[PDB]
C-alpha cells in the first residue's frame, strides 16, 4: 500500500464531514472567504477606499456592513498582503481594501473546490454528476459579476461589495448606468429564476396533493419509506389535473426533473453573458429609433423614454458620492430634476 493510496483512504473515509481530495482546496479556501467576510463586516472600515463606514465596529448593522471593494486608484491590482501596496502591513492591507480580493479569490477557489467535491462524491457514491453541472450556473454568475465585470471596468472598485446594501448599490448602479433591466440577457435570467421558483412551488404542491393513501394518519409524511419501490404520488392524476387546468402537463417524470434543473441554470448562464457585455459597457441601453423620434417630436413619450430620464437623474445625483475618487463636483443647478421636486 503506497502512501498515495493510504492518503486516499483517509481522505475518503465515511465521517460526519466528508473531506475528499477536493476538501484540500475547498475547506481552507471557503474558511478564508467566510472568515475574511465576517472579519471585514465586523471590524474593517471603507473610510479610505469609499469614505464609508462598513463594519459593526463603526455602528453599521447587518444590512449596511460590507467587505467593500478596494480603492479605484489600484486598478486591477490583486492586492496581496505582501504586494507593493500593503507591503506586508496587515493594518494598511485592511485599510486599502485588501479583504475584497482576499474574499473574492478564496471564494472563487472555494467554489471550484465545492464543484470538485460534487464531482468526487458523485463518483464515489455512483451517480451521475448533474449536481455539479447545475452548480456551474452559480459559478458562471460569480465569475461574471465578481471577476469579469470589474476586470472590464477601470478597477475592482466597481465590483460589487460583499454586503447587503453594497449589493443593492451595485444593483441600482447597474440600472442607472447600464440600463440593465432593458438587457435581453438579464430578461432571460429573470425568466429562468422566476420559472425555477414557479417550478419548485408547483412541483412540490402537485406532489403533496396527489399523494397516495399509504397510511392511516392525517399526517401523510409518515406514509413514505425511502426503500419503497413504488411511486408515492399519482403521476396519472397529476397529469390529468394539469392537462385540464392549464391545457398541458408533464407526462414524463424524468423530463420534469431535468426541466427543473435546466430552467434556473440556463437563466443564470444567460444573465452571466449579459454581465460580460456590461463589463465592456456593451449595454442594451437605448432604442435608437425612439430616441431619434423623441429628439425630433416633443410629444412622443413611452415608458422607455421615462426610464431613460430616471437613469439620467440617478447618475447625476449618485455619482459624486458613489465615486468619491473622481472628485465629481456637480453644482446644484446642473442636477436634473422635475418641477417642484
Ligand X SMILES: CC1=C(/C=C/C(C)=C/C=C/C(C)=C/C=C/C=C(C)/C=C/C=C(C)/C=C/C2=C(C)CCCC2(C)C)C(C)(C)CCC1
Ligand Y SMILES: CCCCCCCCCCCCCCCCCC(=O)OC[C@H](CO[C@@H]1O[C@H](CO[C@H]2O[C@H](CO)[C@H](O)[C@H](O)[C@H]2O)[C@H](O)[C@H](O)[C@H]1O)OC(=O)CCCCCCCCCCCCCCCCC
3-class state of residue 162 by DSSP: strand
Q: How many other CB atoms are found less than 10 A from the CB of residue 60? A: 20
| Residue 46 DSSP class | B
Q: How many other CB atoms are found less than 10 A from the CB of residue 40? A: 27
190 binds, among ligand X, Cl ion, ligand Y, none (CB under 5 to 8 A by kind): none
Of residues 35 and 51, the one with the C-beta less far from ligand X: 35
4 marked as binding residue: no
What is the rounded distance in angstroms from the CA atom of residue 35 to the CA atom of residue 103? Answer: 9
CB of 309 to other proteins, least distance (A): 5
| Segment near ligand X (CB under 6 A); pick from 33-41, 67-75, 159-167, 272-280 | 33-41
136 binds, among ligand X, ligand Y, other proteins, none (CB under 5 to 8 A by kind): none
Of residues 151 and 171, the one with the C-beta less far from ligand Y: 151
CB 309 within 8 A of CB 317: no
| Segment near Cl ion (CB under 5 A); pick from 207-215, 239-247, 255-263, 298-306 | 298-306
Does position 194 bind other proteins by CB under 8 A?
A: yes
CB 290 within 8 A of CB 300: yes
What is the rounded distance in angstroms from the CA atom of residue 197 to the CA atom of residue 138? Answer: 16
What is the rounded distance in angstroms from the CA atom of residue 162 to the CA atom of residue 182? Answer: 25
Does position 337 bind Cl ion by CB under 5 A?
A: no
What contacts 84, CB < 8 A, 6 or more positions away? none
Sole binder of ligand X in the list 21, 25, 39, 241 (CB under 6 A): 39
Which residue's CB comes closest to ligand X? 35
What contacts 132, CB < 8 A, 6 or more positions away? 115, 118, 119, 122
Of residues 108 and 232, the one with the C-beta less far from other proteins: 232
| Segment near Cl ion (CB under 5 A); pick from 37-45, 75-83, 206-214, 306-314 | 306-314
Residues annotated in a binding site: 106, 118, 131, 186, 203, 250, 257
Q: Which residues bind Cl ion (CB under 5 A)?
A: 306
Q: Which residues bind ligand Y (CB under 6 A)?
A: 75-76, 108, 112, 143, 148, 151-152, 276, 279-280
Amino acid at each position: 500500500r503506497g502512501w498515495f493510496d493510504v492518503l486516499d483512504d483517509w481522505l475518503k473515509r465515511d465521517r460526519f464531514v466528508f473531506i475528499g481530495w477536493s476538501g484540500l482546496l475547498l475547506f481552507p479556501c471557503a474558511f478564508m472567504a467566510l472568515g475574511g467576510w465576517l472579519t471585514g463586516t465586523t471590524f474593517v472600515t471603507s473610510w479610505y477606499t469609499h469614505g464609508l463606514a462598513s463594519s459593526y465596529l463603526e455602528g453599521a448593522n447587518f444590512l449596511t456592513v460590507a467587505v467593500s471593494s478596494p480603492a479605484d486608484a489600484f486598478g486591477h491590482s490583486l492586492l496581496f498582503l505582501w504586494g507593493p501596496e500593503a507591503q506586508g502591513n496587515l493594518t494598511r492591507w485592511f485599510q486599502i481594501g485588501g479583504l475584497w480580493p482576499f474574499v473574492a479569490l478564496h471564494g472563487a477557489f472555494g467554489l471550484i473546490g465545492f464543484m470538485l467535491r460534487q464531482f468526487e462524491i458523485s463518483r464515489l457514491v455512483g451517480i451521475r454528476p448533474y449536481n455539479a453541472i447545475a452548480f456551474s450556473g452559480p459559478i458562471a454568475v460569480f465569475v461574471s459579476v465578481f471577476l469579469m465585470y470589474p476586470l472590464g471596468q477601470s478597477s475592482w472598485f466597481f465590483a460589487p461589495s460583499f454586503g447587503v446594501a453594497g449589493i443593492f448599490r451595485f444593483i441600482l448602479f447597474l440600472q442607472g448606468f447600464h440600463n440593465w433591466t432593458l438587457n435581453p440577457f438579464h430578461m432571460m435570467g429573470v425568466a429562468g429564476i422566476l420559472g425555477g421558483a414557479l417550478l419548485c412551488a408547483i412541483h412540490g404542491a402537485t406532489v403533496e396533493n396527489t399523494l397516495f393513501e399509504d397510511g392511516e394518519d392525517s399526517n401523510t409524511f409518515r406514509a413514505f419509506e425511502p426503500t419503497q419501490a413504488e411511486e408515492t404520488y399519482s403521476m396519472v392524476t397529476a397529469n390529468r389535473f394539469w392537462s385540464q387546468i392549464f391545457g398541458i402537463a408533464f407526462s414524463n417524470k424524468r423530463w420534469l426533473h431535468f426541466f427543473m434543473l435546466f430552467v434556473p441554470v440556463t437563466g443564470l448562464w444567460m444573465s452571466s453573458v449579459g454581465i460580460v457585455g456590461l463589463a465592456l459597457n456593451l449595454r442594451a441601453y437605448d432604442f435608437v429609433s425612439q430616441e431619434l423620434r423623441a429628439a425630433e417630436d416633443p410629444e412622443f413619450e413611452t415608458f422607455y423614454t421615462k426610464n431613460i430620464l430616471l437613469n439620467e437623474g440617478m447618475r447625476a445625483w449618485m455619482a459624486p458620492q458613489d465615486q468619491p475618487h473622481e472628485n465629481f463636483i456637480f453644482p446644484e443647478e446642473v442636477l436634473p430634476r422635475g418641477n417642484a421636486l
